[PDB]
Design an enzyme around this catalytic site. Structure first.
Site, PDB file in Angstrom:
ATOM      1  N   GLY A   1    -106.548-125.125 -20.516  1.00  0.00           N
ATOM      2  CA  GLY A   1    -106.887-123.734 -20.814  1.00  0.00           C
ATOM      3  C   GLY A   1    -106.525-123.248 -22.207  1.00  0.00           C
ATOM      4  O   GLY A   1    -105.986-123.987 -23.024  1.00  0.00           O
ATOM      5  N   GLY A   2    -106.867-121.999 -22.486  1.00  0.00           N
ATOM      6  CA  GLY A   2    -106.384-121.285 -23.660  1.00  0.00           C
ATOM      7  C   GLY A   2    -104.873-121.351 -23.797  1.00  0.00           C
ATOM      8  O   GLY A   2    -104.348-121.691 -24.841  1.00  0.00           O
TER       9      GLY A   2
ATOM     10  N   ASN B   1     -99.007-122.846 -14.748  1.00  0.00           N
ATOM     11  CA  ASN B   1     -99.840-122.048 -15.646  1.00  0.00           C
ATOM     12  C   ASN B   1    -101.254-121.820 -15.113  1.00  0.00           C
ATOM     13  O   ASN B   1    -101.860-120.839 -15.504  1.00  0.00           O
ATOM     14  CB  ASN B   1     -99.933-122.717 -17.021  1.00  0.00           C
TER      15      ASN B   1
ATOM     16  N   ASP C   1    -111.740-109.990 -10.289  1.00  0.00           N
ATOM     17  CA  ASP C   1    -111.579-108.547 -10.464  1.00  0.00           C
ATOM     18  C   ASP C   1    -112.606-107.788  -9.658  1.00  0.00           C
ATOM     19  O   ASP C   1    -113.751-108.166  -9.643  1.00  0.00           O
ATOM     20  CB  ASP C   1    -111.728-108.144 -11.924  1.00  0.00           C
TER      21      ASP C   1
ATOM     22  N   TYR D   1    -104.872-109.841  -8.429  1.00  0.00           N
ATOM     23  CA  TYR D   1    -104.240-110.594  -9.504  1.00  0.00           C
ATOM     24  C   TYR D   1    -102.846-110.000  -9.828  1.00  0.00           C
ATOM     25  O   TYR D   1    -101.899-110.730 -10.112  1.00  0.00           O
ATOM     26  CB  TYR D   1    -105.150-110.531 -10.735  1.00  0.00           C
TER      27      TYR D   1
ATOM     28  N   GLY E   1     -98.883-110.691 -22.437  1.00  0.00           N
ATOM     29  CA  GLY E   1     -99.877-109.626 -22.487  1.00  0.00           C
ATOM     30  C   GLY E   1    -101.246-110.226 -22.764  1.00  0.00           C
ATOM     31  O   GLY E   1    -101.468-111.364 -22.399  1.00  0.00           O
TER      32      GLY E   1
END
Lengths: 237, 241, 243, 239
Positions: A12-13, A87, A93, A152, A183
């Site tokens: 991932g990122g 992670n 959503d 989430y 964040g």
């Protein structure tokens, strides 16, 4: 014997930044994924081109057995796992009133149940050898709650409750368990967001990776059961 | 109309205490369960409760249950997500079933039960949703990775659902109790709780469920409309932060 | 342009550990003190370290301004500020005097204003700053016999958050580090059997924290990889307090 | 054998709301102020027009001796103090760059030192009698920090440190100590754009709402709530 780290969602990122930092700290790193071989292959190759030698395993962290099978391979290649970064996770959503029970389970079984499914595979090794570093990726949105993410947010907050209980259980056996709560980050998937961030920018995956590297080093043995917030000031106490 | 309260786990130690205080506050209270005798002692007591069967882990069971409740009362103004269980074990020894029974009942309950009633609270621009956490979600607790994960996750839910209902006259808060003098806990031998439990609580005693019920009765009043997304800790000083 | 750190209470158990880490990291270090700084400087020198030391009463704004005058002259500028200086004047609230109260408020909390005020404008100008204020686990859980110390340390985090908000767009972070019980000379003076009886049971990890560990976390906070941490309280207390 | 409450700043928007709530709960109520006799006697008159008898007292909560003087009077009058509400307070907003030492000192000596200055005068009573309630008024700005308020945020954060310690020290003598942390309120002050978008409920809290909460904490059903911080901020701040 080289320290071994297993980073779920390692491609991932944020997983890929974490993996690169942990390898550069001198650890043998395995990354987990659920992608097709070509993705995995191109990823492994470019990493190899930037001086980094990774090994990847397929997993569904929402599925216990799959975690068992995944851990098997990892332990056979590296023989132990010292540093576990939980992670991997997903978003689903919906406003609460629109949210389907399907939206709900995809996020609970994956994001929160991964605490049990993955950490169960490696906890005995850590306790046996009296040493470990477990870093659970939380989120600023488990701290402050978020519009559209009742699911989430419930999972990220639950993740901290798990961090705290495990830390209590493993403190006396040389293992620390912490939540790192980032964040918004300049990842690939990521004017209502930025004004939310005093620092006035997305955080870099590598910044969060840096903090994680520190937590997994020998200098962070007195940090356990803590939530490390790294959010650009987007949330305070 | 008259204010209507739905207390999941409403006949349990805390649930009972809660149902009695919302009743004595002028609310018409339905109590959920997974019965007859309790209801007798209660009407006898001075109060009239309606009991429904439900499995808060199971959405369908919840949705069916809401139908009876609402068929009977018209509305739900006040929801107390109080039902919960523990399945304790060290992490090393904890089974998939320990983990899973607790997530579904303790944390999935948040979505399942709440999904049923949110619609009418928003239409009627009023609601009091009070999710029962635990001091063990706040500070963590040995033998309860599942419980503390579930109870901690509840506050993520509290916080997001207070943000979404904020401009609709609905408040959503968590109440986190410490050790209480429920019938279970009173079975533990005096010498054992003086050794292992009381020294944890600065106030030096178990908290009554009535007290917790009293705090909750306050949060469910019109006077508490500016209290939302809060975790109210009522633990005898056992945990502070 | 070698980064410059100022470390209040810099010769104390934790203060000293901090100065060493920051020095070993390549930062020029100035440490502050309120008797035997000669001796402390000498032992550092023997260990291969060059520190410049400065007298100050942190509880005194004019004292802090004079001290910074000298520090800025010497080092050109201060990029990293560690508000570590701190005393305790323990007493039950019922026995505690106004003197116990004032001493701790002025040294432990007013210091946040008195000190930070001297260095803030330089950081704003250069568009870079790191400010770490040392809190305490007793700020977080409160502590018997320390209504003054808990109040001061708790108040430090209100300070950190406000200054973080105000400074975030000027390249400055502000955090609180809250440590648990640490093995400083003071505390090591405790009989091993009193430590074992009364102190260590509080700590899940089962040992005191080494002042160097806390210093290591702060060194990470002061680097170019910590820019996205601010308004944060980082607890390093060995499991003693969680929330 | 009525319970006696003493509310500092007992004539401010919030202070006055609190005193009314406590009186209507059955408590004899004394109130502290630092206003001229004109203002005070009139405030007293309207209250008495409403069917509430208060006694008012001058004090400077930033001054230990003053508090000591004020407290003898209260005690001579009411014989004891069962419930103490540390509400008095001020602000001197400025950016940190601009704030002066005086800005700093006036907020710290008043808002935070009041914990010691006032509570020292009544703590012994509560302890001997094995019953007390102390509610310390914090601020949502304590929890999140507020631009322009480095002093007031520090004072208000400092106050929970005090709450937690004194809850610990007194928990066996039947006393609770709690912080009540309100967000922005409808006080003739604020009724004097930037604010409401911060508040999820989209309105200012009523001082009366805060006072209801505090009335609960001072009651006999709240003896297991202690060392806690109760937030009543319209959602403005969460965990």
């Amino acid at each position: 014997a080289k320290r071994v780290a297993f980073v779920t969602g390692g491609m991932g990122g944020l997983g890929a930044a974490i993996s690169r930092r942990l390898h550069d700290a001198g650890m043998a790193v395995a990354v987990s994924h659920s992608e097709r071989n070509d993705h995995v292959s191109t990823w492994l190759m470019h990493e190899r081109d930037a001086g980094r030698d990774f090994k990847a395993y397929a997993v569904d962290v929402a599925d216990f057995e799959s975690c068992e099978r995944c851990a098997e391979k990892v332990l056979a290649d590296f023989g132990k796992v010292d540093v576990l970064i939980n992670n991997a996770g997903i978003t689903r959503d919906a406003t609460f009133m629109k949210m389907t029970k399907g939206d709900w389970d995809a996020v609970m079984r994956t994001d929160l149940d991964a605490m049990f499914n993955v950490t169960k595979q490696f906890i005995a090794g850590m306790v046996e050898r009296r040493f470990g570093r477990i870093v659970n990726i939380g989120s600023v949105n488990g701290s402050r709650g978020a519009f559209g993410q009742a699911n989430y947010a419930s999972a990220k907050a639950g993740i901290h409750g798990f961090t705290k209980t495990l830390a209590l259980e493993t403190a006396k056996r040389g293992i620390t368990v912490n939540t790192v709560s980032p964040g918004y980050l300049a990842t690939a998937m990521v004017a209502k967001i930025l004004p939310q961030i005093p620092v006035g920018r997305l955080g870099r995956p590598d910044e969060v990776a840096a903090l994680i590297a520190f937590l997994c080093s020998d200098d962070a043995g007195f940090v356990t059961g803590a939530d490390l917030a790294i959010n650009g000031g987007m949330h305070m106490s």
